[PDB]
Each structure stands twice: as C-alpha cells, then as structure tokens.
Amino acid sequence: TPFRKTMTSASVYTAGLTGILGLGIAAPNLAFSQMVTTFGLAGIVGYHTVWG
Amino acid sequence: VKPGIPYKQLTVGVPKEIFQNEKRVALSPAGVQALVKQGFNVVVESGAGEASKFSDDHYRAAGAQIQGAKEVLASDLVVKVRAPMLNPTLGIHEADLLKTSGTLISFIYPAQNPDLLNKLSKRNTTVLAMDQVPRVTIAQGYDALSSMANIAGYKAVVLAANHFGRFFTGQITAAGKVPPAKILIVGGGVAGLASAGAAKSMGAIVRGFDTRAAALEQFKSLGAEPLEVDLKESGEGQGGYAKEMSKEFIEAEMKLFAQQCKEVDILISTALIPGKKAPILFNKEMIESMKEGSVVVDLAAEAGGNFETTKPGELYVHKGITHIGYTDLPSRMATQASTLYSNNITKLLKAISPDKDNFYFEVKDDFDFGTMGHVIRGTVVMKDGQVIFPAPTPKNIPQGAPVKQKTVAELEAEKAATITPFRKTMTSASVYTAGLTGILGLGIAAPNLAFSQMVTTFGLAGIVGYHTVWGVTPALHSPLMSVTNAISGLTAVGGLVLMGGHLYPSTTSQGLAALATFISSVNIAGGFLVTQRMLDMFKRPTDPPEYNYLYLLPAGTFVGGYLASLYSGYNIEQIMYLGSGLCCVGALAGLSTQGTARLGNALGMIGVAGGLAATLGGLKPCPELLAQMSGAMALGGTIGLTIAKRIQISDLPQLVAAFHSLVGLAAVLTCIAEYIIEYPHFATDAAANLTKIVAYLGTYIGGVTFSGSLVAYGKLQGILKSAPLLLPGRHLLNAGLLAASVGGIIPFMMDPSFTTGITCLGSVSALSAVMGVTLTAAIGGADMPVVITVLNSYSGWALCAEGFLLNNNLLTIVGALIGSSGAILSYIMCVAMNRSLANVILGGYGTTSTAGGKPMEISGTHTEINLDNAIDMIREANSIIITPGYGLCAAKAQYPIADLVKMLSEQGKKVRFGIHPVAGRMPGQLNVLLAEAGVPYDIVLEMDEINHDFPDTDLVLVIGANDTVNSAAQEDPNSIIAGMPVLEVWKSKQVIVMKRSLGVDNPIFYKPNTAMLLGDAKKTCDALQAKVRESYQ
Amino acid sequence: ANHFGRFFTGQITAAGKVPPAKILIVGGGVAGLASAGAAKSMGAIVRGFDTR
C-alpha cells in the first residue's frame, strides 16, 4: 500500500539521523568531528563517481 | 492605369482533347478554384472530365460555366493538353476555332512542331510552351515533363505487377522461404528514381546504373545498387543531362547489360537523349538471355526505345519476355496526371503575372540565370504570332558550383582536426599543473589547522555538489533554483552568531547583524513555500496519495533529540552541522526522478531547521535577546510567507531575482559587522591578517550580486528598458572598476587604523555595486536566463566566503552546493544557445560557429490557410507533437491548449510536447507553466529525446516558437544562430504555425509542407478547441 | 493498380501534396492480412475490420 513506502522511507531517515546524533554524543573532541565530516563527504564523492 | 487588362476581363478556355489514346484533362474541379481566385473566368467543355472520372456537376459547382466546343476554344486564354490539331469530328484546324491574338498554353514542342508553329503564327496568337521550362532553381513549381515522368514511372512500377509471374515482395512462409526478385533500371533520371522508390516500397531489389554519376549516386542514396562499368567515358555533358558517348563505352555497357540480363528478373529501360534518337541499350539475343517469363519495360517508347526489338504501339510476350511497349503511360493514370498538370499550371499562372489582376506576362530578353524573365523568354516562343522561338543564352552562371553546400556540423570536425594530440595533451596537463600549484599556493598562506580543514570540507562539498546537480531531471530545473534560494537563507546562521545585546540592539555591529537575520529570514519561508507550491502541480491526480505528513517523524526526533541532548549537558553542534549539510544535499538529490520530489523538499526543511537550532543552541542566549531573535525571525518569516502564496506562477523570475538581492545584501551586512566586531583582536593573532582578505572578498561578491539582481528585476518587470545600454567605451570603465577593486586590498592592508579599513570596505561595496549595474544593464532581453543563474552562483559563493569568515562548517557545504548548482545551470543553457559566458556578459556578437559576413538569404513561397480546413487537417492525423514558445504563456493561452490535448488524446491519438531549454526566461520555466494548466508530466518530453521521432510524426504544430525551430542553425554557416541545437521540426509530413503576421527570417516558413494560421494566439487556440469540441461529440 | 487512377502512396513534393488513399479490407481471414501487408508496403492507409 502507498502508506508503507513512505513509512519505511521515513523510518530509514530517522534511524540515520539518530545515528548521526549517536556519533555526536560519543565525540571526545573536535578532531573526530572534523574527520567524520570529511569521511562522510568523501563517501558521497566515492558513491557518486564509481557509478560513472 | 496598369499595363495590362485585369483578370476579371479575362476568360479562359479548356476544350476537349480530340487526340487518340489521350485520357488527360486540362483542369480538374480542384483546379477551377485556383485561377478563379486569380480573377480569370472559367469556361468548360461538355464531358471532358468524365474521361478522367471527374464530374461536370462538380466542375460547374467549382465556379465554371460549361460551354460548347468551338466556343470553348474561342476565349481569351485557350489551354489544352495536346497542341492545336485538326479535329476529325468537326473538320477545322484548332487555330481557326480559337480567337485571333489569343493565348495558348500546352505541350507544343515547336522544335518538332514547326509547321504547327507556322499555323499558330497565322492567327497571331501567343504560345506558352509548358515543356520548354528550363531547369532553374525556381522552376520546381513548373516542370511538366518531370511530373509526367514521375506519373509514367509510377504507372510502370505498377505495371510490373499484372505482367510478372511471381510476387516481388517476398516472405519467409511456413511451406518454404520465398526469395525476392531483382529489378533492372536502364536510364537514370526522375523516372528511374520513382520506379526505384516504388520497387523498394514494393520490396524489390534494384541494380540500376546511369551515365550521369550524380544520377547513380542519387539512386544509391535512394538505396539502389548503382552498377559500374569498366569504361572511362564521361556520362554528363554541360549540365545535368547526358551526352554523346563513343561505341567503346556503349559496347562495355552492352556486355555488362548482357551479363546482367540473365541476373535480374525485371528490366526497365527509360534511357533517351532529348532531340536525338534513344540508343538501343538492349541487344537481340541479350534480351532473350533472360529467363522465360521476363519483363522488359521500354519507357522511351515515343523516342524509339532502348532495345533491339521493340514495337512501340503494343505489348507482346517475346519468347518468354514481356515487351511492355505501351505508347501512352500518361494515358494510364490520367486523374493524378490532370491534378499535377493543374497544379503546375497554377504555379505557372501565379508566376507569369504576380499582380492582383494585371495579366502582364512581360517579355524580357537580357535575363539572368534563375531569373523568371529567362523562364518567360524560354516559355514564350510564339509571342503574338511573332517568333521569339530562338531561346537566349543565360547570364553569368557558375551553374551550381558549390553543390556540396556548406552544412554546419562538418566545419567543427574540420576545426577539431588542427587540435593535434600533442597540443591536446599539453593543454590537458597544463590544467593540472595550474591546479596543483594553486593548491600549493593555498597551502603556503595557511595560518593554522582550521583553515586547512575548511579547505578540505569545501573541496569535497564542491565535488558532491558538482555530481549531484546533473542528477536532477531536466523537467525540474524550476524547483531547483527555488529550493537553492530556499537553502540560501542560511546566512541567518551567520547573522545570529554576532547578534546580541538585549531586547533592543545597543551597538552598531549588533544593529547590522539583526537586520541581516531579518532580511535573510524572508528567503527560508518564501523559498520553501514556493517550492511546495510548484511541486504540487507536477503531481498527477491519478498518482496514489503520498502521505507527506509522515516526514515529521524524522524531523521532530532529530531536532528534539538535539534539544534533549543539550539539555542533558552535551555539545552536539559540530555533528549537527554535518546532519544539516547532508539533509541539504539530500534536498537536491531528492528531486531527481519526478517521484521523489516531495522527499527533496522535506529533507531541506529538516536541514534548515537543524541548522538554525544548532546555531541557536551553540550561543546559549539569555531570554532577553532570545526574544529579539524570535521577533526578528518571525517578522521576517511572516512577510516571506505572505508574498510567496500571493504570486501567480508565471511571474516566478521576479521573486527569484529579489531573493538573490536579499542574500547579496545580507552578506555585505554580515561581513562588515564582523570586521567591526573583530577589530581589537588583530594584534595578537595569526589568522587575523587573512580574515581581512576574506571580508574584502565577501563584501565584493555580495555588493556585485545585490545590484546586478536589482537590475535584472527591473529589466524583467519592463520598468527598465529591454534594450542594452551602451553609451561609453564600456571596457576601460569595467577594467578600471575591476583594477580599483583588486587594488583596494593594499590600503586595506598596510595600516591597521579603524577608519581606513571601513572606508575601504564602503569603497569596494560602492564600486562593486556600480560594476554590477554596469555589467548587468548591457546584456539584452533574450540573454536574460543567463544572468539569473550567474547571480545564483555569486550568491552561493558569497555564502561560502562568509563561511570562511566565521569558520562555520555548515556554510561552506551549503554555499558550495548552491554555487555549483548555479554554475551548472548557466552551462546547460550556454550550450543550449551556442554562445559562451564571456560572449554574453561582454555583449558579444554572433556565436561560436559564425564565420565571416554575407548571411545567405531566403527564397521560396509561403502558404496560408484559414481555420476551417486546418481543424479538419488535425482530424485526420494520428500523431501530433506540439512545440510551444514563450509567446504562448505570455499571452495566457496555455489554458485552451490543455483541453485540446486531452480531447485529442481520448480518441487514440499521440499528442506530445517538445520543449526547447531556452524557451522561457528561466531554466525549465515552461514545464511548470504547462503543468499548471493540467498536462501530465509524462507526455512532456525534452529536446534530446523528441528530436529523433519527428520522422515518425504525422502532424507537427508550432505555437509561437520562432527561434528554436529554425533550419538556419543546420544549413547556414553565416547566420547568427549557426550551431544552436534546435528541434528538427521540418522532418515531418505537414507543419502548422500559429503566428500573428508573415515576416528574423526562418526557412521553415518556405517549404512544401508548412501552413501559417493568422490572428491572436488565444483567439486562435480557443477557436481550435471550439471546433474540436463541436466536431467530435 | 490499373483500376485506380491515382497514385497509391502519394508524396508531398514541391509541386502539390498527393493525398494517400484509403483502402477498406472488408473481411480479414488470411487473405485480409496478406492484402493488408501488400497495401501497407505499397503505402496506402488501410482500415480493415472483421467480426472475429
């Protein structure tokens, strides 16, 4: 049914956003936050460039 | 008075043909509407049309007055198919039954009718020889022998059947496979091309060859097998016709024909030299050298024949060979023959005296190659009985020397051949050494760790933003810049950071960084409201309802989890900036398949809410100024929400320009605010000697993009002139302003006084605004959709500069995304129109493919029809493709098209839309204007997927589009638009154009298949839907 | 052909548009499909129909 498509998609996004906050809670310093940011952005570049 | 008697005093005469074995007619009933439309009277014979199966009742109803026999010849304009001969039913020569000093127009050929010429000179009449029309470029409307040859070739290819023994198509049947038959064509002209096209339609194999190499090449381009004999004799003579060859090439072709005579099953001989006897191209035993059941067609029957045995008046089975020697192929298909004769006579009578009613038919002797006076001299040989029979020579003619006309797409392959691979890889590696020394230069001036970290997060955000903006579907570019103007309201984040005081502003730093928040808060609410309005029009009513309220489940848990998480005693700001940056990327990655469009708006709202909440919690405000932040944000959002639900969609680029101008003002109001607030810290710091260079750069970019988008708004609303303003030299001025801008950085260095910085910041904001007004004014009116995207880019790069300024990590990601999106949207249309960006900003002329001067001119004649036949023309078409322009939507006429399209689609038709990407004044601005009226998304196709079924398309309508359906972009290397990839709308069967007048010029107007409806566009389109609605129930 | 006085296919050249013909295939068995293939190869507009 068209309810469960959006429900599953919204469940995936709320799991991802609470995982981002969970990585935020255990952060000891700003160096780890910097490495998480450059890690995520390099991951999206890597996802996007090897379909090419 | 005009030099000639008008057509109302001009009666015409079409008498009965008295010759034997001639079924042709002079003019049909459809031919009687024309030339009565010219004004000439119509007098008809008794029963001539019934021989060609035409009713004399319909002939008299067409506007004619049927008369006798001698009374049909004694008019002011006598016309027949054959020449004036002696009638056996009533004994008289036909010149005596005609009026003295009358008009005669028929196939005469006085080279073979010299005694008939002496008879026609006796009555002192005027002769108009139809067959004597020379091969001119304007002679496509009058060529009697060409149409007669096409009719004879169609009749002969039909007469292949009911003479052969087996089928010529061929199939793979269940009882066994059937092989096709090979057909021979001897004599390559229009007749050979027509027989080859009809045989290939019938599914035959052709192996015809000709003496003229252009004839064999055109036959091979039609798909025939142009054979080649081993004889070095030139087939062409002085022009396109054949010439006299020796017996050596004749014997070589005779041996090849005897070899191929036992190869093919069908043989058609159409070879003949005009004025002399046709050469016998078939021998006595080589003709019997085929199988028992052969078919030998001799289409040179009146001029002898191309066989050693051919009786020219009867058919015969010659020892197992069909001797198709019928003397009158033109008497076999006389209906379409008379139709073509009437059409050619209509073009001839239109050309002979093109006035309203003058009947001039002037006599010119010194006449040019291609001149209609030369055609008049060649056509009229007996002028009032007097002999102008000796035809004059043509004027100075190269006679079609550049027959390989310079088509456009090949000169770029010639230009990309001096791009020899050494200099190609040299200019490849030069780019990478420039880039690597650039990043080394940024490494040299790096003050600390945080600047290098900011460079890395900016660079990887740039590569994400480059790869994801090509990912959007090209039918949703109009939500794209609305959602990037929505996300660019995150310079409120950099406004809130240095906001403070109490419920009132106290200082002037805090005074500037409160209306920074106020003017930026319009952007968030306005952009997301207008994006949500635009994505509720692409949704079909048949689409199952996506429950969009369920996306509050991530958003509330995200923001409230940050709220509980800083209530618990943490600091989750530097990861919340990552979360908002990834939700802002997912906003633009959402709208990429037309079905996940609402995901890519909700994620943007989640990201902007997360970014605002993070920068709010990361300052820990007292409740006295938290009231100020809430009041400023709410007073921004109320105006931003109340001017986004009021606008009508077709006025979108105005608020797009306004929302760039507000971001451009917000960046300059937040750069000098931190330069004021960071002044007593420049002594004991290291990065402080480049927060100055970042502030200067950001103020420059913001001051440009403020005023440039103001000028673009004033030019879109009609208030400023739609003409470019170019009084001064304009390049010393812009170079002087740019040199002052780049030179202003050293007085802003070199002395640390509090006044000398701020006066230089004011100076660079002032001269940058004047630079923006100077550049953006002298742009144009059709080059408008460039500056929207370029101003979008400068807004994004201003956000990124301010992000370097505050060392905030969300702003570089968001700004690099918006700036890369603006750059990609400028590049897509600067390849759509084939110009450059410096060829538009600097007011340049032409394009990237225009050569030198002399734009070659149009010729050919146009055709207009009224409303009642056009709609019945619609009613017998299966597939329709409509190609709108901006003039459709600017006249509010997209609504009555939206009913026409559905009522045609509900009867089995194939109505679709072609869209050129520079139609509206914004990227994809007319997809939304079609989707408002009620067209679905799935039948609106872009250019690159509809430009290959215009061959397989019956009717092509054109509404208002004048610049994107030209063929000067394909066939002229001198015009302005050469190289611009346009729709190939001339590849079809019939074209309609809805335009208010007649004639900056496009040669799709001058084609055999093009109409022109006249009138107001709305007043035409509602008449179209009215006729459909009252003609289909 | 040799019964119809008009061209079967018809072209729009620069001398006048030749309208294509309309052929009625009354009754389609096997010969209906065969003659329809022969006409569609010839270039006519066929509008045959049958009870089956």
Swiss-Prot record, chain B:
Pfam families: AlaDh_PNT_C, AlaDh_PNT_N, PNTB, PNTB_4TM. Keywords: Acetylation, Membrane, Mitochondrion, Mitochondrion inner membrane, NAD, NADP, Transit peptide, Translocase, Transmembrane, Transmembrane helix. The chain crosses the membrane at residues 428-446, 454-474, 480-499, 511-531, 549-569, 575-595, 599-619, 625-644, 655-675, 693-713, 731-750, 754-772, 786-806, 810-832. It is a multi-pass membrane protein. InterPro entries: Ala_DH/PNT_CS2, AlaDH/PNT_CS1, AlaDH/PNT_N, AlaDH/PNT_NAD(H)-bd, DHS-like_NAD/FAD-binding_dom, NAD(P)-bd_dom_sf, NADP_transhyd_a, NADP_transhyd_a_C. Its main location: mitochondrion. The keyword Transmembrane helix applies. It catalyses: NAD(+) + NADPH + H(+)(in) = NADH + NADP(+) + H(+)(out). Residues 1-427, 532-548, 833-1033 are mitochondrial matrix. SUPFAM superfamilies: DHS-like NAD/FAD-binding domain, Formate/glycerate dehydrogenase catalytic domain-like, NAD(P)-binding Rossmann-fold domains. GO terms for cellular component: mitochondrial inner membrane. NAD(+) binds at residues 135-137, 190, 210-212, 240, 253, 272. NADP(+) binds at residues 886, 918-923, 960-964, 979-980, 995-999, 1016-1017. Its EC number is 7.1.1.1. Residues 676-692 are cytoplasmic. One of its GO terms (biological process) is NADPH regeneration. PROSITE patterns: ALADH_PNT_1, ALADH_PNT_2. The modification N6-acetyllysine is found at residues 23, 350. SMART domains: AlaDh_PNT_C (SM01002), AlaDh_PNT_N (SM01003). The transhydrogenation between NADH and NADP is coupled to respiration and ATP hydrolysis and functions as a proton pump across the membrane. May play a role in reactive oxygen species (ROS) detoxification in the adrenal gland. Homodimer. This is NAD(P) transhydrogenase, mitochondrial.
